Amino acid sequence: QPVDLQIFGRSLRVNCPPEQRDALNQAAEDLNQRLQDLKERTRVTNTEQLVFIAALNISYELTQEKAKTRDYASSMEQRIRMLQQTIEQALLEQGRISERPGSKFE
Amino acid sequence: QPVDLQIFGRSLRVNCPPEQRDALNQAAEDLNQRLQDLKERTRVTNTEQLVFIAALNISYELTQEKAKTRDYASSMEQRIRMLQQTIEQALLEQGRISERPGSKFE
Amino acid sequence: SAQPVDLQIFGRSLRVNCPPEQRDALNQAAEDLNQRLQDLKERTNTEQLVFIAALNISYELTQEKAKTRDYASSMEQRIRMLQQTIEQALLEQGRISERPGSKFE
Amino acid sequence: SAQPVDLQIFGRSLRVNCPPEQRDALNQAAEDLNQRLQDLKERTNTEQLVFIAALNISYELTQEKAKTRDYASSMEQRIRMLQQTIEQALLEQGRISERPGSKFE
Ligand SMILES: [Cl-]
Ligand SMILES: [Cl-]
């Protein structure tokens, strides 16, 4: 299903089903913007060099996002365990107090 | 509203509205049983002495129950604070991870 | 080891066997019963007065026990509510963590 | 302080300015991009191949961000659920702790 795209003055063709077309348009728009911003802050105007550097940057950004995902998950596991421990403490306390043996004088 | 009761061979009269009558019957039954059990384990058969000792025992039992109530409450306040602290930690963590600044090469 | 303790309760000398570890509690019970008997006499035979005071304390103790029961029942619900939150968090983690990625080509 | 680093990416020598604290990340990015470009060439001009690889990574990064968002949304609900449990516990404590006692007489 060949889709023709224009990114940073370059003609690309990519096979893409219609269900992914909006995502493809968004990615084309993202990569266009990335290359424009990279060109601005580095003054490089060679396109092939720009796209290599952009691809390395975005690769690193994906690794960084996956770490954020992993870190959020690791933190949530701990929070859940902490919650479960407060339930266990609630039951232990309830037991400790409720089983208190009564006293009498005689 | 005079109610005539029989407890441990003694005739009592107590003013008691109808809305409290079941509670009065239950209390009469409780004090009857208490005096019978006290007589069994102490061998005392003087009624006035038994009822004095029973009243002291039950006074102490009420103080003991009120302590249980106070203790349960003190424990629950702590458990609630512990729960609230896990919520606060959840928000702090979320913030810590989510505000992580991204890196790029160039 | 229980030793006899002489108490004064509402005009009446009373001997009670009590271990020293409970002596303070005994004094406190004697003080509580003395105050109850005095108040009762004003509101209303010593022996009959003590039966009536013991009935009142019985009812108060029943009421205090109902408070214990009602705290416990209430907390059973709270724990069920927290456990449901934990079970959902775990489920959501699995649902999100397991989604397959897509690519174009 | 960024220094130029010579890399080899899919047959192409490339100079990238990178601070030493990010050198390992750069090597890892180069390895990831090299593997992507190879796989892509098998599935499917170097420059065009790199545009396509960058499109794929863009989409994957968008998808990874949606996971972050979806975890956050899910947790907002979980926190609301816990806060509701806390508010109820406090309310119940007050309700029970404040009940007036009764007596007979
Ligand atoms: Cl009373
Ligand atoms: Cl790819």
Author numbering:
A (entry chain A), B (entry chain A): 4 to 109
C (entry chain B), D (entry chain B): 2 to 45, 49 to 109
Sentences from the study reporting this entry:
Cell division in most bacteria is regulated by the tubulin homolog FtsZ as well as ZapA, a FtsZ-associated protein. In the presence of GTP, FtsZ polymerizes into protofilaments, which further associate into a ring-like structure (the Z-ring). ZapA binds FtsZ straight protofilaments preferentially to crosslink FtsZ protofilaments; thereby, ZapA bundles more aligned and straight filaments constituting a coherent Z-ring. A FtsZ protofilament has polarity and lacks symmetry, while ZapA is in an equilibrium between homodimer and homotetramer, which are related by C2 and D2 symmetry, respectively.
To acquire the structural information of the missing dimer head, we determined the crystal structure of K. pneumoniae ZapA (KpZapA) at 1.8 Å resolution and performed a structural comparison of ZapA within the ZapA-FtsZ complex with the crystal structures of KpZapA, E. coli ZapA (EcZapA, PDB code: 4P1M18), and P. aeruginosa ZapA (PaZapA, PDB code: 1W2E10). The cryo-EM structure of KpZapA within the ZapA-FtsZ complex was superimposed well to the crystal structures of KpZapA and EcZapA (r.m.s.d. = 0.851 Å among 128 Cα atom for KpZapA, and 0.911 Å among 127 Cα atom for EcZapA). For the dimer head on the missing side, KpZapA and EcZapA overlapped well, but PaZapA did not. The N-terminal tail of FtsZ in our cryo-EM structure, which is sandwiched by two ZapA molecules, overlaps with the C-terminal tail of KpZapA and EcZapA. This observation indicates that the C-terminal tail of ZapA moves aside to accept the N-terminal tail of FtsZ when the ZapA-FtsZ complex forms. Furthermore, the α1-α2 loop of ZapA undergoes a conformational change to recognize the N-terminal tail of FtsZ.
